[PDB]
Structures are given as C-alpha cells and as structure tokens.
Amino acid sequence: RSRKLILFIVFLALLLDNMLLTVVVPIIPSYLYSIKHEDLLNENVQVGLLFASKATVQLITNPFIGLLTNRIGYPIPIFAGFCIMFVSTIMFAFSSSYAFLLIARSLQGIGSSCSSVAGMGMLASVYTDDEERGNVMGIALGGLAMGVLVGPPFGSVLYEFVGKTAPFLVLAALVLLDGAIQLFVLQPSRVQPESQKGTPLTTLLKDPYILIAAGSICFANMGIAMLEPALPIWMMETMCSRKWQLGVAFLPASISYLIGTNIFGILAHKMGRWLCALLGMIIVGVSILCIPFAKNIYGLIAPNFGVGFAIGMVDSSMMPIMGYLVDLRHVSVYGSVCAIADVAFCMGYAIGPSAGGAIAKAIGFPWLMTIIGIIDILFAPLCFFLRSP
Numbered sequence: 518r519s520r521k522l523i524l525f526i527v528f529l530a531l532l533l534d535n536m537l538l539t540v541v542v543p544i545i546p547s548y549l550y551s552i553k554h555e556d557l558l559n560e561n562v563q564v565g566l567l568f569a570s571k572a573t574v575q576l577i578t579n580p581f582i583g584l585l586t587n588r589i590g591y592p593i594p595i596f597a598g599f600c601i602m603f604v605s606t607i608m609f610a611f612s613s614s615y616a617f618l619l620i621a622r623s624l625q626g627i628g629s630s631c632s633s634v635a636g637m638g639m640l641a642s643v644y645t646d647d648e649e650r651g652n653v654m655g656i657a658l659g660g661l662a663m664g665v666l667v668g669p670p671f672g673s674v675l676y677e678f679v680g681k682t683a684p685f686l687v688l689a690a691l692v693l694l695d696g697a698i699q700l701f702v703l704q705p706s707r708v709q710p711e712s713q714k715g716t717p718l719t720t721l722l723k724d725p726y727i728l729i730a731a732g733s734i735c736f737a738n739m740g741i742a743m744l745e746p747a748l749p750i751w752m753m754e755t756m757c758s759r760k761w762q763l764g765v766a767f768l769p770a771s772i773s774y775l776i777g778t779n780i781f782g783i784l785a786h787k788m789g790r791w792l793c794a795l796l797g798m799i800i801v802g803v804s805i806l807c808i809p810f811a812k813n814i815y816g817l818i819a820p821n822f823g824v825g826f827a828i829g830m831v832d833s834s835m836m837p838i839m840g841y842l843v844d845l846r847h848v849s850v851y852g853s854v855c856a857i858a859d860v861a862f863c864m865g866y867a868i869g870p871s872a873g874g875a876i877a878k879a880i881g882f883p884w885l886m887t888i889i890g891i892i893d894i895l896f897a898p899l900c901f902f903l904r905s906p
C-alpha cells in the first residue's frame with residue numbers, strides 16, 4: 518500500500534497521455550493522403566484543426582474538471598478520464614473516418630486534462646511534506662516529458678512494420694494495464710473534501726509579469742506545435758521519405774529536450790533565468806529559421822536538435838520563475854504554477870497547428886518557418902524586463 522505506487526499510476530497515466538498524443542502525429546497525414554489519393558490542402562487544414570481540437574477542448578474543460586474535483590471527489594474523475602482515454606484508444610485503433618478522428622481527439626482532450634489535474638491533486642495531497650511534494654511533482658513531470666521521447670519512433674516503427682492498427686492496440690493494452698494497476702492500488706473511493714486556497718489563477722493571469730513568461734513558453738512550444746503537422750506532408754512532398762523516417766525525424770528534438778533540461782536545471786539558477794530564456798528564444802529562432810535550409814533527412818537532424826534543445830532551454834528557464842514570481846508577489850499556493858503552465862501550453866497548441874495550417878494553405882512552408890522565426894526573435898527582447906521584477 519505504498520504511496521509510491523500511486524505515484525507510479527499517475528506517472529504512467531500522464532506518460533501514456535503524452536505518448537498517445539504524440540504517436541498520432543506521424544500517422545494521420547498518411548491516412549488522409551492515402552484516402553485522398555484514391556481540395557488538396559483542405560485535408561492539411563483539417564489536420565491542423567484536428568491537432569488543435571484537443572488543445573481547445575482541454576482549455577475549455579479545465580475549469581469544469583477543477584470544479585468537479587473540488588465538489589464530487591478525487592478518485593472518480595481519474596477513472597472517468599481513464600475510460601475516456603480507453604475510448605480514444607479504440608477510436609484511433611479501429612475507426613478510420615476523419616470525423617471519427619476529430620471526435621476521438623476532442624474526447625481525448627477531456628480525459629487528458631482530467632488526469633493532468635486530478636492526478637497531480639492526489640500526488641500533492643498524499644505527499645504531506647512540501648519539499649517531497651515538489652520533487653515528486655518534478656519527477657512526474659519528468660516522466661511526462663519522457664513520454665514524448667518514447668512516442669514517435671515507437672509509433673512510426675509499428676506503423677511501418679505491421680500496419681495502421683497495431684500500435685494503437687499496443688497503447689490500448691498499456692491503458693488496460695494502467696487501469697488494472699489503478700484499480701488494485703486503491704480499493705475504496707472517498708469524497709475527499711480537501712481544503713484549498715480561495716485565491717484564483719485569473720489574478721495571476723491578469724498580471725503582465727507572469728504573462729510575459731507564459732507567452733514565452735507559448736511561442737516557444739508554438740514552434741514545435743506548428744512543426745508537428747507540417748513535417749510529414751513536407752516529407753511526402755518533394756522529399757520522398759520512405760514513410761517511416763517520421764519517428765527518427767522527431768526523435769532528436771525529444772532527446773535534445775531531455776538532455777538540455779537535465780543539464781541546465783542546475784545551471785540556469787546559477788547563471789540567470791532571464792538571460793537564459795533570452796538565449797533559449799534566440800536559439801529557437803535560429804533553429805526554426807534553419808529547418809527549411811535542410812534538403813535531406815540527414816540534414817534535419819541538426820535543426821530539430823537545436824529547436825528541441827532550445828525549447829528545453831526556455832522551459833528550464835521559465836518553469837521555476839513562475840513559482841518565484843507567484844511566491845514573491847501573489848498568493849503562496851502550490852499547483853497554480855502547474856495551472857498557468859498548462860493554460861499556456863493549451864493556448865499555444867490551440868493556435869499553433871491551426872494557424873500553421875492556415876498559413877500553409879496559401880503560404881509555403883519556408884515562409885511559415887521563417888516568419889515564426891521572426892516572432893521568436895521579436896519576443897526575445899521582452900524577456901529582458903523579467904530580469905528585475
């Protein structure tokens with residue numbers, strides 16, 4: 518009856534959430550191109566809306582699930598989001614209709630948000646010690662980040678080796694194992710009238726100082742959000758990739774993310790968070806500019822590594838400064854940093870792929886990548902105001 522067990526269930530829950538969020542990336546455009554082979558960019562823009570559907574649904578849903586966890590209890594909605602995730606797995610596996618894909622992703626968003634809120638809530642509640650709670654949240658988020666490293670090569674290899682249905686089924690089997698673990702971990706379900714601070718996050722979002730860092734993360738991951746759906750079609754077109762290099766194309770970004778965060782989480786505190794974020798944004802800009810420069814799959818290993826490393830740079834700079842500013846000049850509560858980070862990520866993935874597809878409909882991929890480079894460069898100086906809050 519170890520608490521580390523519940524840590525394991527929540528860890529694998531959000532890890533599986535990201536893994537399923539990510540393995541869907543290099544396969545759906547293949548579906549759409551294959552179906553349409555037997556309105557050329559309408560499929561691309563509807564892919565962009567498909568990717569943005571989860572972000573929009575989660576953004577709308579998060580207050581509702583927060584209130585629901587406040588009112589009815591902690592154990593019920595995690596299992597509800599579990600069942601939702603299982604339905605999403607089955608719809609990705611067996612269903613092949615585009616509208617079915619939109620419904621599956623939109624449904625998936627609710628369960629993903631519900632897990633990402635309520636599991637963190639239990640992880641904080643059971644872990645009474647504040648420092649212990651903080652470091653366990655850190656390791657849970659580290660697994661959350663490592664899930665998107667696991668995802669893409671797994672999905673691409675199982676897409677090419679077996680077919681269109683095998684890897685979603687493997688993810689579904691992982692879902693069932695997770696649910697068995699969750700059910701066996703906790704036999705009873707309690708109402709859990711946990712007490713929480715009444716100060717909301719709308720005041721935190723209203724502050725420009727937090728908003729600058731939130732926007733920094735927003736565009737920093739809007740780069741990768743816009744990078745997600747365009748690359749597969751960009752490799753089917755004028756690139757003649759052999760239908761499997763998608764996973765090995767996205768892998769360097771993830772591995773660079775993990776190595777950069779792991780090697781700068783101890784250094785950004787020493788050297789300075791504001792200039793660290795400044796350099797991170799500059800590196801995002803230059804790598805994003807250089808992604809069009811590559812003309813072969815071998816070439817893309819460098820700029821993807823750069824953008825992943827720089828996104829890790831920005832995250833390592835900006836994750837602790839949220840809590841620092843919140844403790845300095847706002848309500849001293851835990852979990853609001855996670856809430857503001859989540860709303861920033863949802864914002865970015867809401868307008869990332871949608872605007873990416875909208876631009877790609879009439880403007881080519883090179884100008885898209887360059888222009889988001891200009892937004893990155895232009896946003897870089899605004900981080901200087903964060904040096905002395």
Ligand SMILES: COC(=O)[C@H]1[C@H]2C[C@@H]3c4[nH]c5cc(OC)ccc5c4CCN3C[C@H]2C[C@@H](OC(=O)c2cc(OC)c(OC)c(OC)c2)[C@@H]1OC
Pocket residue numbers: 535538539542658661662665669738741745767768770771774825828829832836854855858859862
């Ligand atoms: C898409 O999936 C995501 O959206 C997550 C990742 C996004 C993003 C990403 N996508 C990729 C897709 C690729 O091929 C398609 C290749 C590389 C990447 C990378 C590298 C960079 N990155 C990692 C991922 C980062 C995740 O978020 C957090 O790890 C996080 C961390 C925190 O502290 C560290 C938080 O605060 C305590 C927090 O609040 C909830 C969230 C993020 O949200 C869940």
